[PDB]
Amino acid sequence: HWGYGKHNGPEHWHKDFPIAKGERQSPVDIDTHTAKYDPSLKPLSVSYDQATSLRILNNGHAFNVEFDDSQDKAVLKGGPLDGTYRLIQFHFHWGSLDGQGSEHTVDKKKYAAELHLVHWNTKYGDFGKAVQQPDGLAVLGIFLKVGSAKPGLQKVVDVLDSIKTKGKSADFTNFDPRGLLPESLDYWTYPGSLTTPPLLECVTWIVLKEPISVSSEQVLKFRKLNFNGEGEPEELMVDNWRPAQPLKNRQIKASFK
């Protein structure tokens, strides 16, 4: 029954998930001055031309846009990655107010929200086997700030009314995640974890430096979602972010000078 509240939120997770206090937990604060440019990083390749979305789901902690990952399509490679990683889902974390909501921070700055595009390493055959591996996953993280609308986000916004409550899902085909990407692929990268239980330490994080802008109206619609199920007392789905965790024995690398 983990969640984001007082009695079940991030400070409680370690009881059921002791890895919460592990050596490579996420998210982290990205100290931009300490991050070092890495000339060993290969160009990052985001190839989403053939991405095939299937469905959108309110899982009671966020909403997931799911992809058919049965064929080699929507792939992430290059950068810090060895081999090819396949897109399985994306989701967001966001705040109750524009001043908070991101999981990663940049010199302690919190963005209004953060998009996570989740990929599994194809060497491991599927997502379930990949999460048993230290290099099983790559998550592409993208910050959201409130300003101009993101036109490519609107289709997601408009379907949220149909998945208000935990356990609701809806068909969501033909969504193009290319419409969610900023111009620049400049990034920071480090080894980390899932940011929700089970908090598994499988993730190569790739966090883009350039945020996307979304409108106040768009993020307000995220905030109308519910953590609770249909017929249950309303608890708005807001502040579904884990705070920054200790960096410990890690270096953050920059893809740019």
Cα–Cα distance, 207 to 112 (Å, whole number): 15
The CA-based dihedral angle spanning residues 107, 11, 199, 247, taken in that order and rounded to the nearest 10 degrees = 30
Closest approach, Cβ 25 to Zn ion, in A, equals 13
By CB under 6 A, what part of segment 78-137 binds ligand 4WA?
116, 118, 131
**E strand intervals along the chain:** 29-30, 36-37, 42-47, 53-58, 63-67, 75-79, 84-94, 105-106, 113-121, 137-146, 169-171, 187-192, 203-208, 212-214, 253-254
**For K ion, how many residues bind (rule: CB under 5 A)?**
4
Residue with tokens 């810090």, as numbered in its chain: 80
Q: How near is the Cβ of 101 to Zn ion at its closest, in Å?
A: 12
Q: Does residue 7 carry a catalytic annotation?
A: no
The residue among 139 and 142 lying less far from ligand 4WA, judged by its C-beta, is 139
Residues 111-140 that bind Zn ion (CB under 5 A): 116
Longest pairwise C-alpha distance within the chain:
54
Nearer to K ion, 60 or 136 (CB): 60
Minimal distance in Å, beta carbon 244 to Zn ion? 14
On whether 195 is known to bind a ligand per the annotation, the reply is yes
Could you give the string, one character per residue 59-98, with x where binding to K ion holds by CB under 5 A and - elsewhere?
xxx-------------------------------------
d(CA 76, CA 69): 13
Give the CA angle between residues 10, 217, 232 to the nearest 5°: 50
Q: Which is nearer to Zn ion, 222 or 256 (CB)?
A: 222
The three-class DSSP label of residue 207 is strand
**CB-wise, 60 or 177, nearer to K ion?**
60
Determine if residue 91 is labeled as part of a ligand binding site: yes
Does 195 bind ligand 4WA (CB under 6 A)? Our answer is yes
Q: Which residues are annotated as a binding site for substrate?
A: 195-196
Active-site annotation, residues: 61
Give the footprint of K ion on this chain (CB under 5 A). Answer: 5, 59-61
Give the footprint of ligand 4WA on this chain (CB under 6 A). Answer: 116, 118, 131, 139, 194-196, 198
